[PDB]
Amino acid sequence: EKMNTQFTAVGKEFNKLERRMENLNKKVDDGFLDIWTYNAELLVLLENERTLDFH
Amino acid sequence: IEGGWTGMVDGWYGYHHQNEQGSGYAADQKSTQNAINCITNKVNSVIEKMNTQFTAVGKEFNKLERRMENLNKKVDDGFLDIWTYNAELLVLLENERTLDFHDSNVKNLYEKVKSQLKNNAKEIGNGCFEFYHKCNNECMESVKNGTYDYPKYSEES
């Protein structure tokens, strides 16, 4: 439930003179993927330990 | 331990007695006060980490800058989703520890009484003990606080 997934992820493209847009846009996409990957693993790894101790 | 109390006040953890000297609930100040310190430090830590000093005024873009609006919109939405997840996860995770934290304290206090309250008192299971020796307030408060006089009493032994 916490991990929502309803959003738009279609990529964009920029011309040659807008290299700043592409680098800035690329960072935004990469930044979130790194964050979500860390959040997904940390929550799953942390919860597993509690469950094993819970039993 | 099996079932809470309502008459008791001024303490999360407390004892009870039924001696002829007087029946009434009491609180363990040392145990309760220690627990409060962790709660106060725990809640303070959450607030301190969650900084809130920043600029959030929105911007607007013309019709030909649709790329800016979508990119700017994603940045705003992305952070809100992240903070919402982080806020709930930290709060939900901390609550579980606090609930378990109290159980250890009360259970730890119960075991501490057992060590100080040797076999002279019969344990009936439901978070209570039956004494083989008649005790007055002087001895009753001995068990409640950190001083006891076990060698004095050896009745039925």
Binding site: - | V9, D10, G11, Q29, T32, Q33, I36, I39, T40, V43, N44, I47
Partner: protein, 120 residues
């Protein structure tokens, strides 16, 4: 280190109610007990009542028992007053005190105090 700060001095007409707010420097979440005390001009102090930590249990002396109400917003580490039915005898100084523990035991932290007088 912590500091106790109270509101400024105030003067009220007889038969009115006076409210004084006590706050602690860096007033983050706190659970220390609070109380109040009156120091009449040229006379000794006398206890009023206080709060007990998270439990929010209030006790007041039998002298009034209905005229003073104390509630503490623990999140802001603030203690309020709702004294009512002031009279000439009530002209004195009110101080905010803490005991260092959730209970209402002895006090070892004091504020700067507040002087409140009643007259027309």
């Amino acid at each position: 280190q912590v500091q106790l700060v109270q509101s400024g001095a105030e003067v009220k007409k007889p038969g009115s109610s006076v409210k004084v707010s006590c706050k602690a420097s860096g007033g983050t979440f706190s659970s220390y007990g609070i109380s109040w005390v009156r120091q009449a001009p040229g006379q000794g102090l006398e206890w009023m009542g206080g709060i007990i930590g998270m439990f929010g249990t209030t006790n007041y002396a039998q002298k009034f028992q209905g005229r003073v109400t104390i509630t503490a917003d623990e999140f802001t580490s603030t203690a309020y007053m709702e004294l009512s039915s002031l009279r000439s005898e009530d002209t004195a100084v009110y101080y905010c005190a803490r005991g260092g523990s959730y209970y209402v035991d002895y006090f070892h932290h004091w504020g700067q105090g507040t002087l409140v007088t009643v007259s027309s």
